[PDB]
């Protein structure tokens, strides 16, 4: 039963990136101010924070495997910190332009970064963070990268050039390019995590959200309702719903079967920029980052 409860919200500078730890009640936020925070959302106490740089930090993920966080910023750099000690693990220039998005491979020591330099790059931490592959083909800022959880030898990039490209590790060209018809570009791409549907989802400045069948390349549905740029849209890992956030300042929960809006939330923190869902669906936790801070919600 959809019974949405606010677990924890705090105010901060604009949060551009967000992620859940899989075994600790922690959420990571990365801010436009160059700061990153790890909050325990149940005790409502800060566990660790770092002033990483002076530029926006747009991307941040836990690497629970290694007790790390990995972050990417407008100063062109990827940095990794141990969250137990605060020690900096590595610090390198990844792209000659903004880093928009970082994805972590679930079983292999690989990280993907998407950039305004028109590329996605693959880094290998068991090979001294060497650059192992550059994926070229996009024609505008690549805004989002995501592994297929059902087959992480492939991944998707969403780009302001109005396309999504799907790639295989070890190969130089996309397996396919999706021409979305979202003419103001693609800000976000996500996979449906379960094996019954070959679905992907995209969000755009053109105010639409689109669902795709990645086998036929067809648009299954178009979700309209937001009144300003849609920053993200994701499938929930366990609940039959879709969650989106917009510069109109709302989160929307859509029925994933009928594609109708079930609930619109204005959490009162201005524009919404980022989203995370708890990897195992614990308390059906979700978290979103906004102009004025973040909120962690229990959906049911």
């Amino acid at each position: 039963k959809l019974d949405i409860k606010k677990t924890f919200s705090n105010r901060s500078d604009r949060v551009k990136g967000i992620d859940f730890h899989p075994t600790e009640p922690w959420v990571l936020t990365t801010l436009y101010s160059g700061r990153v925070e790890i909050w325990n959302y149940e005790t409502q106490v800060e566990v660790r924070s770092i002033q990483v740089t002076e530029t926006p930090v747009r991307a941040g993920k836990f690497i629970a495997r290694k007790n790390w966080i990995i972050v990417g910023s407008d100063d062109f750099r990827i940095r990794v910190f141990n969250y137990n000690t605060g020690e900096k693990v590595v610090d390198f220039e990844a792209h000659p332009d903004y880093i928009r998005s970082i994805a972590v491979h679930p079983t292999k020591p690989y990280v993907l970064s998407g950039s305004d330099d028109l590329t996605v790059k693959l880094w290998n931490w068991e090979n001294n963070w060497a650059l192992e592959q550059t994926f070229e083909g996009h024609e505008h800022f690549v805004m989002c990268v995501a592994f297929n959880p059902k087959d992480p030898s492939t991944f998707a990039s969403g780009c302001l050039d109005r396309t999504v490209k799907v790639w295989s590790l070890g190969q130089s060209t996309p397996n396919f390019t999706l021409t979305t018809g979202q003419e103001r570009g693609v800000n976000y791409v996500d996979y449906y995590p379960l094996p019954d549907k070959p679905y992907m989802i995209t969000a755009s400045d053109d105010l639409t959200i689109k669902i795709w069948d990645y086998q036929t390349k067809s648009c299954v549905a178009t979700l309209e309702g937001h009144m300003s740029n849609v920053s993200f849209a994701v499938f929930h890992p366990t609940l039959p719903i879709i969650i989106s956030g917009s510069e109109d300042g709302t989160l929307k929960i859509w029925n994933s079967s009928t594609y109708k809006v079930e609930k619109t939330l204005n959490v009162g923190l201005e524009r919404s920029w980022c989203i995370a869902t708890h990897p195992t669906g614990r308390k059906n936790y979700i978290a979103s980052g906004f102009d004025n801070g973040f909120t962690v919600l229990s959906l049911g």
């Binding site: 604009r14 436009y32 505008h140 800022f141 805004m143 302001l160 800000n187």
Partner: peptide, 5 residues
């Protein structure tokens, strides 16, 4: 710069 914010 698109999407500066």
């Amino acid at each position: 710069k698109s999407h500066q914010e």
